[PDB]
Amino acid sequence: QLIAGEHIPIVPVFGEWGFVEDKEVYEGVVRLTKDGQRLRNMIMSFNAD
Amino acid sequence: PLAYYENPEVPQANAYMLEAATSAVKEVATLGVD
Amino acid sequence: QLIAGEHIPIVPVFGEWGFVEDKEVYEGVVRLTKDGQRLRNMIMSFNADIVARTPKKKPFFWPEQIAGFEHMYDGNDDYPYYLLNRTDENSGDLPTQPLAYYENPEVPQANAYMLEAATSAVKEVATLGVD
Amino acid sequence: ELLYKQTAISRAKRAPYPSRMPTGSGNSFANLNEWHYFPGEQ
Amino acid sequence: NRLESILSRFDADWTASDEARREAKNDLFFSRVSQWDDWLSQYTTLQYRGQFDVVRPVVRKLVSEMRQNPIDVLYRPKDGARPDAADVLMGM
Cα torsion through E30, E32, E38, E44, rounded to 10: 160
Q: How far apart are alpha carbons A42 and B18 in whole angstroms?
A: 9
The answer to whether residues E54 and C122 touch, using CB atoms and an 8 Å cutoff, is: yes
Single-letter amino acid code for the residue at A40: R
Resolution of the coordinates, Å: 3.2
Q: How far is CA C19 from CA C10, C26, C127, in A?
A: 21, 9, 22
Report the distance separating Cα D21 and Cα C70, nearest Å: 31
Measuring CA to CA, which residue among C79, C96, C58, C92 is closest to residue B3? C96
Asked if A20 is an interface residue toward chain E (Cβ–Cβ < 8 A), one would say yes
The alpha carbon dihedral of C4, C8, C13, C16 has a sign of negative
If one counts every other C-beta atom within 10 angstroms of the C-beta of residue C44, the result is: 26
Calpha distance B18→A40 (Å, rounded): 5
Give the C-alpha separation, C60 to C102, whole Å: 7
Q: Is B31 on the interface with A (CB under 8 A)?
A: yes
In angstroms, what CA-CA distances link B34 with C21, E57, E68? 43, 12, 14
Q: Indicate the helix (H) or strand (E) that contains C126.
A: none
Helix (H) or strand (E) holding C72: none
A-chain CB neighbours of E51 within 8 Å are 32, 35
3-state secondary structure of D37: strand
Q: Which among A29, A35, A47 is the nearest to B14, CB-wise?
A: A47
- Please tell me which residue of chain B has the smallest CA distance to A30: B29
Distance CA C83, CA B4 (A): 11
Chain E nearest C-alpha distance from B15 (Å): 18
- Kindly determine whether residue B28 and residue E52, on different chains, have CB atoms separated by under 8 Å: yes
**Alpha helix ranges (H) inside B1-34:** 12-28
Phi and psi of A24, rounded to 5°? -70, 145
Chains touching chain D, criterion 3+ CB pairs below 8 Å: A, C, E
Cα separation of B9 and A20, whole Å? 48
Contact with chain A for residue D33, Cβ under 8 A: no
Q: Which residues lie closer than 8 Å to C28 by C-beta, 6 or more apart?
A: C15, E27
Q: Find chain B residues with C-beta within 8 A of E57's C-beta.
A: 27-28, 30, 32
Is residue D5 classed as helix, strand or coil in its secondary structure?
helix
As a whole number of Å, the end-to-end CA separation of chain E is 42
The angle at the Cα of D18, spanning B7 to C103, to the nearest 5 degrees, equals: 30
Chains D and B touch (3+ CB pairs under 8 A): no
C-alpha to C-alpha distances, A43 to A30, C17, C45, E24, nearest whole angstrom: 20, 47, 14, 38
- Do the Cβ atoms of A32 and E33 come within 8 Å? no
Contact E57/B28, CB-based, under 8 Å? yes
By the 8 A CB rule, do B32 and E64 touch? yes
Query: Which chain C residues are Cβ-neighbours of E62 within 8 angstroms?
Result: 29, 128
Can you tell me the distance from the alpha carbon of B29 to that of C51, in angstroms, rounded to the nearest whole number? Answer: 24
Report which residue type is found at A30.
V
Q: In terms of Cα–Cα distance, which of C39, A27, A32 is closest to B25?
A: A32
- CB neighbourhood size of C76 (10 A): 8
Smallest Cβ distance to B12: which of C101, C106, C115?
C106
Compute the distance between CA of residue B27 and CA of residue E60 in angstroms, rounded to an integer. Answer: 13
Which of D17, D20, D27, D28 to mutate to probe the A interface, most A CBs <10 Å? D20
Residue of D20, E55, D34 lying closest to A40 (CA atoms):
D20
Q: Cβ neighbours of residue E36 under 8 Å, at least 6 residues apart?
A: C41, D26, D28, E49, E51
Residue contact C49–E48, C-beta within 8 A: yes
Which residue in the set E19, E27, E62 is minimally distant from C31, CB to CB?
E27
Residues 6+ apart with CB under 8 A from C65: C84, C85, C95, C96, C99
State how far the Cα of E66 lies from the Cα of E83, in Å rounded to an integer.
32
| CA neighbor of C118 nearest in space, from C8, C7, C4, C40 | C40
DSSP class of residue D30? T
Do D30 and D23 contact (CB within 8 A), yes or no? yes
> What distance in Å separates residue D17's CA from the closest CA in chain C?
7
Q: Which distant-in-sequence residues (6+ apart) come within 8 Å of A38 by Cβ? A: D22
d(CA E25, CA E43): 23
CA–CA separation, B6 and E12 (whole Å):
74
Q: Does B25 touch chain A (CB under 8 A)?
A: yes
Nearest to D25 among A34, A42, A45 (CB): A34
Residue A26: C-alpha distances to residues A11, A14, A31, B23, E57 (Å): 16, 7, 10, 25, 16
User: How far is Cα D13 from Cα B12, in angstroms, rounded to an integer?
Assistant: 25
Count of CB atoms situated within 10 Å of the CB of B28: 21
Check D26 against E43: CB less than 8 A apart: no
Helices (H), E1-92: 2-16, 18-32, 56-67, 88-91
The answer to whether residues C30 and E55 touch, using CB atoms and an 8 Å cutoff, is yes
